[PDB]
Amino acid sequence: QSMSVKGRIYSILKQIGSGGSSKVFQVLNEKKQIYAIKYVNLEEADNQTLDSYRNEIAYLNKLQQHSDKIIRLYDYEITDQYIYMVMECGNIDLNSWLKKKKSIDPWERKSYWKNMLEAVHTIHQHGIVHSDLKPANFLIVDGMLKLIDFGIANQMTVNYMPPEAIKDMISPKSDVWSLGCILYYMTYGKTPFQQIINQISKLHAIIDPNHEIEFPDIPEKDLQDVLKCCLKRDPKQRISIPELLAHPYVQIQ
């Protein structure tokens, strides 16, 4: 099986994953270099959906020059029938990696955490709030974490959902909470509310101040401060990304 993107021929090795409308493959160019190709069928796509797809591609393209913590998009082919996106190949998504890895190295965690802040910080600088941050969004590329999507594409788990989202029934700070849950998972092996199976009661716990989130004593006092600061229910009281970037946990070994 083979495909053509802007004149260049790509041999398919395997399908990495498949969404609703789209499919991602592990491919090879004529010089036997590896890439990931996102193929999106546009036959059933409506105007709003087409525009949201065009918008994420635009941002992914502009944000290339601003941060290397954003997945590389080398080429793309857009017609009325499909989209082909030529990207760099990552080893594994952070979610699938965390499911396999029971115990995480404190150095790896610090490194991945700084990467996530850099990627999320970049999208904020451009006025984008992902609003749906998850481990899955992040890709391990040569021991570096890279942000895969910006949330704009999505809508074509609730364990990472901020309280202000459920209470409103969203700002840079909504992403802070979600990142804080990713780090809480990377620290305690569980998300702050994983323990609640009933999805109704879970949402109640996320918005309830009487529900005190546990922060068991860990040898990294700075990491525990990061977690307490990120998981503040009041967005006004919650720490910011530029602040998190100067925190001793990020900046000191």
Ligand X SMILES: CN(C)C(=O)c1ccc(Nc2cc3c(cn2)cc(-c2cnco2)n3C(=O)OC(C)(C)C)c(Cl)c1
Query: Is residue 136 involved in binding ligand X (CB under 6 A)?
Result: yes
Q: Which is nearer to ligand X, 87 or 98 (CB)?
A: 87
Q: Are 82 and 22 in contact (CB under 8 A)?
A: no
Question: Shortest gap between Cβ of 55 and ligand X (angstroms)?
Answer: 14
Report, in Å, the least distance between residue 90 CB and ligand X. Answer: 4
Point out the catalytic residue in the list 132, 149, 168, 175. Answer: 132
Give Cα separations from 17 to 20, 23, 25, 38 (angstroms).
10, 6, 7, 9
Q: Does 139 bind ligand X (CB under 6 A)?
A: yes
Sheet holding 34-41, edge to edge: 2-5, 8-18, 22-28, 34-41, 82-87, 73-78
Report the binding-site residues for ATP: 16-24, 38
Helices (H), the chain: 47-62, 94-100, 106-125, 163-168, 172-188, 199-207, 221-230, 241-244, 248-251
Least distance to ligand X, CB of residue 92, Å: 4
Side chain identity at residue 22, one-letter code:
S
Q: Which stretch binds ligand X (CB under 6 A): 84-92, 124-132, 206-214, 244-252?
A: 84-92
- For residue 78, report the phi and psi dihedrals to the nearest 5 degrees: -120, 125
- Under the binding rule (CB under 6 A), the answer on residue 83 touching ligand X is no
Q: Does 29 bind ligand X (CB under 6 A)?
A: no
175 is catalytic: no
Contact pick of 5, 27, 36, 117 for ligand X (by CB under 6 A): 36
Residues 87 and 73: beta-carbon distance below 8 Å: yes
Pick 50 or 92: Cβ nearer ligand X: 92
- Which parts of this chain interact with ligand X (CB under 6 A)? 16-17, 24, 26, 36, 38, 71, 87, 89-90, 92-93, 96, 136, 139, 148-149
